[PDB]
Structures are given as C-alpha cells and as structure tokens.
Design an enzyme around this catalytic site. Structure first.
Site, short mmCIF file in Angstrom:
data_model
loop_
_atom_site.label_atom_id
_atom_site.label_comp_id
_atom_site.label_asym_id
_atom_site.label_seq_id
_atom_site.Cartn_x
_atom_site.Cartn_y
_atom_site.Cartn_z
N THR A 1 0.85 -1.19 0.00
CA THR A 1 0.00 0.00 0.00
C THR A 1 0.88 1.24 0.00
O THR A 1 1.97 1.25 0.57
CB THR A 1 -0.93 0.07 1.22
OG1 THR A 1 -0.15 0.12 2.41
CG2 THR A 1 -1.86 -1.12 1.30
N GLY B 1 2.21 2.30 -2.71
CA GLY B 1 3.23 1.90 -3.65
C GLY B 1 3.64 2.95 -4.66
O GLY B 1 4.65 2.76 -5.35
N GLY C 1 7.72 3.02 -1.00
CA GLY C 1 6.82 1.99 -1.49
C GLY C 1 7.10 1.67 -2.95
O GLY C 1 7.17 0.50 -3.34
N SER D 1 9.23 4.19 11.80
CA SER D 1 10.19 5.25 11.54
C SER D 1 11.07 5.44 12.78
O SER D 1 10.66 5.13 13.90
CB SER D 1 9.47 6.56 11.19
OG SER D 1 10.37 7.63 10.96
N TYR E 1 3.50 12.73 14.32
CA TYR E 1 4.04 11.74 13.40
C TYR E 1 4.80 10.66 14.17
O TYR E 1 4.50 9.47 14.04
CB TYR E 1 4.93 12.42 12.34
CG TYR E 1 5.58 11.44 11.38
CD1 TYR E 1 4.84 10.81 10.39
CD2 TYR E 1 6.93 11.16 11.47
CE1 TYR E 1 5.43 9.90 9.52
CE2 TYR E 1 7.53 10.26 10.61
CZ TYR E 1 6.79 9.63 9.64
OH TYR E 1 7.42 8.74 8.79
#
Lengths: 249, 248, 249, 249
Positions: A11, A13, A18, A136, A149
C-alpha cells in the site's frame, strides 16, 4: 530468485519507498500489487515498474476500498504471501498549534489503516507468510513539531509485538522496518515548494546522519525484501532500522 | 551476493559459526573459519568444502590473533566481512560467581571481540561489513546468567560508538542477537544426561512464542544479509532473530 | 526524612556524583558510609559531609579491600539498607588506539567491581534493601572514542535485569541511574589541565543537552535518593535516566 | 510538604492509580484538582480526599469539557504547576476481532485526549512546570489480544520525546510513568465479572511479576510525585517503569 512465486502487496506503492520496494520485490520475482489513491498516478507507477506489477486504486482509510482490493487479489492470485503497509502521512505541527484534523488524519492513515489492512489481509495469508510495517526512527526519537508523526510510528512498532502472539496460531510473522531520513518527494517537500528550499532541508538532514548521506529508497527496499524472504523465518516482532546510525548513536 | 568478498568467521567449527560459514560460502564469499581445536577445525573445513579455508586460533591470545590476520594479508590481502562468533557461557547465580567465572566470560565475549576487530581493521576495505555476536540475554534477564548477559550487552553497545570511530574508514558495524538456536552449547546447559539436554531444549522451545528452537541456518542468513551490500544504510543497529521472545 | 534510620554505603563518595549523593542520603537521615580513592581526599570529604558520615578508603579492584570495608560496616552499623556503587572510571580511546590495559582497567573498575561489591555486600543487606548501580547515557548511545567506557556501562545495566531474578528471595531490588552530562572534576579533566580546555568542553557539552544546561550533581543524587527511599518499592530492574532529555530525543 | 505551593491537576482522578496519585500529591501539600467522567463517583472521591481537593466532571475526549475545566483552574487557582494525565481506557480484542469502534475509543482516550489535554493546559503552566503522562509496560511488550491498548500506550511515551523539544522554550518538562500490573478494579473487572474469576486472574497476573505480587496504587503514585517534585528537574522525556521487573527481565 528468493521471492519467486510470492504475491506481495504494497500500500502506498506509487511513490518513494513503497515504489522502490515494489521495484525490488518484482526484481526478486514476486508478483507485486501496489495501491494508489489517484488513478492517473497509479497507472504511471504501474507502467514504469512493469515486470508484472498490478495497480489497484484504493484509500486505505476507507473500509470498503480495502475489501475490494483484497477481493481482487483473491480473484486474481488466490493468496497473499507478503504484506507491506507503506501508506503513510506526515505533517509538521508544534505543540500549542496542533489541530484536531492534524492529529486525526495522521493517526487514521499511519496507525488505523495499518490495523485494518492487516486484519483484512489475514484470510488470504498462508502459514509462513511475512508482514512488514512502516515504522520510523521518529517513533523512538524526538523531533520538534513532529510529535504526532512520531507517536503514530511508535504505535505502529508496538503493534508488532502484540500481533506476534495473535498471529502465532496462523503462523504469520509481523516485523517492522524503520527508515531513517530517505531521499523522497515527501521529504523534499517539507523543505518547501522552491528547489532551493528542498536542497537546503535535504542538506541539513544529511548532516544529521552520522555517515552524512540521505538514504536512497532502494536501500530501504532491500530491508523489506529480506523481511519478505524466507531468510527472515526466525525473526518475529523485531524492528530493523536503517538510519545510517542516526538513531543508534 | 557475497561473490568476490573475503569473509572471516571466528568460532566457525560449530553451531551458528558453522552455519554462518556455510551460508557465506553458498553466497560466494571467500570463507576462513577459526577453531579452538584442530581436529574439529580440520573435520569442519573438510565438511564445508567450497574453497573454505581453516586456521586454528584462540581469541584470548593476541599471538593467535596476530598470526591469523597475517595469513589473511598474504593469501587474500583484505577482509570484506567480519563476524565475531567466538563465545563462552556458564551458569553463575549471585552468590555463586567466581572471579574467574567473570574473567573468562568477559575475556571471551567482549575483550576478544574488541581486539579481533582492531587487528582486522587494517585489512578491511572501504565499505566493509562487521557483524558482532549479541544475544537476547544481553537485553533481558535470566536467573544465574547475569555474567553472560552483561557481556553481550557490552557487545551490543560497542557498535554504537564504533559507528563513529569507523566513519572515516567507511566500515559499518552491526549486531545480530540470536534467540535460542539449537546448539551443542544449548544442550550443554541441560547437561550430559540425554534427558537433561532433551528436557532443557523442550523447555526453551516452550519459551519461544512460535514454540520452536532456531536452526543455526536461520541465524546465519541474518549475518549474510548484514554482510551483503543490501545493508549499506544499516549501521550500529541490532537485528534480533528470537522468534519474538525478546520482542514480546 | 524518608531514608531516616537507614545505613547506606556509597563507593566513590569522595568526588562528583558520589559526594553529592552522600550528602542527599545524609539529609534524609540515613547513616552514610563513603569510600575513598586516597586518604587525604576521603578525610576532606567526610569533614565536608559531617552529619555522622564515616569514610573507609579501599580499592574496589581488590577483594581484600572489599572484605575490610564490608567488615567495618558490619562491625560499626551491622546492616546495609541502601547500596550505591558509584566507583567508576572513564577514559577516551578511539578504535585502533585501544590498549589491552585500557579495556582491562575500565572494565575491572566499572564492571568487575560492581559484581564483587554487590556479592559480598548482600549478607548485611536486609529484605527490602535497595541497590543502585551507576549506569550512564553513554551505555545506550554511541560517542566517538568512548567505545570501551560505554560498553562497560551497558554491561552494568544488563546486570540489574538478571539480578532481580537472583535477588527475589532476598527482597533486594536493583535499579540503575544513568546520568547525562554532569559538571564534575572528571568531566572537566576530559577537556584538559587548562581551564580553557575545561571551560570549552563544558560549554560545548551544555549545548548538546536539549534543555541546554549541564546537570548539577545533586540533581543526579536526588534520583539516587528516590530509588534508595521506600517510594521506589515497586521499581525493580529499571533504569532511570536524568539526562536533560539528551538520550530521550 | 515538597509540592506545597504547587497546583496539580489529575485527569481520571476518581479511581485507582489516579485516585492514589491525587491522595499522595495532596499529602505533599499541592492543591489538587481531579476530573471524573461520573459526578457521583467524582463527588465521593472529592469528599474522601479532603484537603481542599476540587472536582470538575469532564470527559477528556470532548474538547469542550477540556476548555471548561481549564477555565475553572484559571478562575480559581490561576496556574497549573503539575499535570498528570491518568484518564485511560482498556479493552481486549485479538487481531481478526478488532472493531473500528474498539480502535477509535482506545486511541481517542489514551492518545488523542492526552495531546489536547496537554495543549490546552500550557498557557496556565509556568516555567519549571512538570508534566507526567500515563505510559504502560504494554507499550514496550506484547500480550495477546492487547495490540490496540499497547500501541496507544507506546504512542503516549513517544510524544514526550518530541514534546521535550517543543516545550524547551516554555521551561516545562515532560516525563512518562509506565506502571506494571497494579491491583485495580479495571484489572479485576477484565479477568471476570465473578470474584472467583477475578481472584484467579489477579493471582495469575501476580505470578507474572518477578517479585510475585501485584502493585498497590500508592506505589505507582510516588513516582508521579517524584516526577512532580523539583527533584526530577534534570529528567526530561524519560520513562520510569514500575513493574516489579516484569518488563525489565
């Protein structure tokens, strides 16, 4: 090669990591399905990749889009070996300026979509299938104006440890790739819409990396491919971080 | 992936070191393995084949280390990959820890690791990959294993600072932390009773969330991935193959 | 006065964090015993501390020195409610310049001493006694030329997690304090004999902390007193970091 | 007396750990304001605590309730020195059984409400104010059917690291307390409606603890009191875990 005969879905992508992951998985010989929100860009991505890459237009936040996409895989391929939930959102807001919309959109795409993408994927996934989540280094570190985030990415990483037990009977293993700063359109945009602004931010972030260079997206993709492969069979719930040493030091 | 790369594995004779050397040879690396005992080493190197070369060596001796790296310089002249697998483990609870139960363990796990890298470093080219033998015991607690676990935690810490030391070199340091991997050493702890080894391994197998001891080949693949150039952006990281035992 | 009526032994009491800690444990009313690298300094510290503090100078690298000090406490007080192992050494050597002795000294003193100080101490310590180890943020992060020092601290922290299992029947609890950069003779001497070298390092290190301010030794001591006090009763095996946020971001 | 002359707010104050924290914070002499979802339960708490504790019924998920509550603080006390966010929700859902409502409810209360509770507080908080967030060991570990709860708590901790930088100019410090299993109605309620069902569950949870006993709520409260106190002045962005060693092993 290693991924030969494997169906892989990415997803988010269409661009960045991605897109590079979809490229790398196809090179290894997986059938790759990529998802994009907008049809024109998704088509452009599918054309450029080639190599039996198939595009489905979907919004991971919409529950119905997920059902349709997973229905297409079941109709077309009949199973899903590899799931990489790469779809993600990020914005800068400092405390005291954080809107309800800035929180909700971040957590809806980064965390909420990951849960339901994974849940819907499971019926298709066989025993020994491998799941990769988009963590992350922001999840483990502190950055000014990036609290929302980072918290969403930290929530993503934790999902892996508990999901290890939930998926135990299934035999599926879930692991997290945490990229450090990677050269992508999204990172450059934070520098601004001016090319000189994009270069300035990218240069500053590179200095922060210990080795001194932003990641190429291909370097992140290789981690996902390793996690996708049978080589990662004993790994479960672990976090593999490619930051150039930024989060490690 | 490893074709055209010179790789040295200490503790190559058995278990993960044996599995690691086998995998690096399959990938096409020049592989040199280190053994304490020649008969185990000679029989190991013969089994490996595939242009595997064996040097007997005790890491706790600077001399044995100095000799081995000179041979690498003469034969290959550079080491692309370094895996420090030589390791020792014993059970001592607080109240049972000898001064040399500590000294032997920290020599072998930590001091030998520091020096092996230092002597290896001049041979290593720009862009080379170093992998250290961490453990999940380094990150967790097990009764009577404080001495072993604390040494492995030191092993993990070295990489973070060594990233900064090695930056001008362009060499990269990373840590692999195995979970319970079936090994003579895992069986050793059960004892020399056939039921003692078997009873123990089943007990640790129950401890892993998936419910199985690792085959040493599963740990080996991780080191090769770190060895390969695909790991170019990885530096100072710890990669753990535990079946989730340390992750949960 | 939470620690009133408790016997506390602090190794490395003469200088820096150990001196400030000894003051704080004394303020709550604990019996405090401090150890000295040299008699001259140990006598000066006890006079500065007053408040019924007694100094025994011994060298932790020596078992006989440990047995002597451990005998004096049992003869004089006969109990050890709180133990803080502050005795430690730190030196800078980059990879490729590390001597055999430098690894041996740092590790014997920081790591080897902790195991033997703790092992011999235990008969004096009653059920419910609290032990504090001297970790550092250097144990979890990486700094150039400090590999041996940091690895030693990482070994210190790991001990506490396994030791909780050993000490359960004991009722003793082991926890680790990891200071960030704290103004000390040891920190300054790193800059050099020259005041400029000392001043320049301290200002630069101050910038690295997010709050931007170098720590006072008492601020580390107050954490040690809290772990020493009965309030830390449920904490076991934990590491508490007062870093100004440096390792946290 | 250490918290004397400090105004403290605890959301979710009515029961369990939040109630104990309010009791301990009051004991040190802070003026304490507690928030409860239900007026009857809140009034009984306000009645029981005494010591001039003030109660405001409020649902933290509702933004208006937050605005109303902080308006009362500004009208009455004029500042907020200490803030502890105890309001939280927990439910069991295994992967493949996780509803959208189970996800949303947990994250709204555990994570979203925390962000906005903290954001609205800031104008009131002076330089040197202390903020404590409710972490959990579930954020660091994995337990079957608790993926959402653990992910939310893991996100809670991450906010602190970024908030360290956001709040540095403010002079406010953000720290996280992560309790291990604590005997509470919610832990009991979770195992079974029946008391017999609860005893086995509480006994089972007790076995998981290394010391072998569930925590008392006052044991968690002391850590918040320490974090509230000026003794924690150098601590920023850190997580203090009181688990009896469960997550540490």
């Amino acid at each position: 090669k290693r991924l030969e005969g494997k169906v892989a879905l990415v997803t988010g992508g269409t661009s960045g990591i991605g897109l590079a992951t979809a490229k790398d998985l196809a090179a290894q010989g997986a059938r790759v399905i990529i998802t994009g929100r907008r049809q024109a860009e998704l088509d452009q991505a599918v054309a450029a990749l080639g190599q039996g890459v198939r595009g489905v237009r979907s919004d991971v936040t919409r529950s119905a889009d997920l059902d349709a996409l997973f229905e297409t895989i079941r109709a077309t391929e009949g199973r899903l070996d590899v799931l990489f939930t790469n779809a993600g959102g990020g914005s800068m807001a400092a405390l005291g300026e954080i809107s309800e919309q800035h929180f909700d959109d971040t957590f809806e795409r980064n965390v909420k979509a990951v849960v339901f993408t994974v849940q819907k994927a499971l019926p298709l996934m066989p025993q020994g299938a491998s799941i990769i989540l988009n963590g992350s280094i922001a999840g483990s570190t502190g950055t000014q104006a990036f609290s929302i985030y980072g918290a969403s990415k930290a929530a993503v990483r934790a999902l892996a440890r508990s999901w290890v037990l939930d998926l135990k009977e299934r035999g599926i293993r879930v692991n997290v790739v945490s990229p450090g700063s990677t050269r992508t359109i999204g990172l450059a945009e934070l520098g601004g819409d001016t090319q000189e602004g994009q270069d300035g931010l990218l240069a500053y972030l590179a200095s922060l990396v210990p080795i001194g260079r932003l990641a190429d997206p291909s370097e992140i993709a290789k981690v996902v491919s390793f996690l996708a492969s049978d080589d990662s069979s004993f790994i479960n719930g672990a976090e593999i971080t490619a930051d150039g040493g930024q989060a490690q030091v």
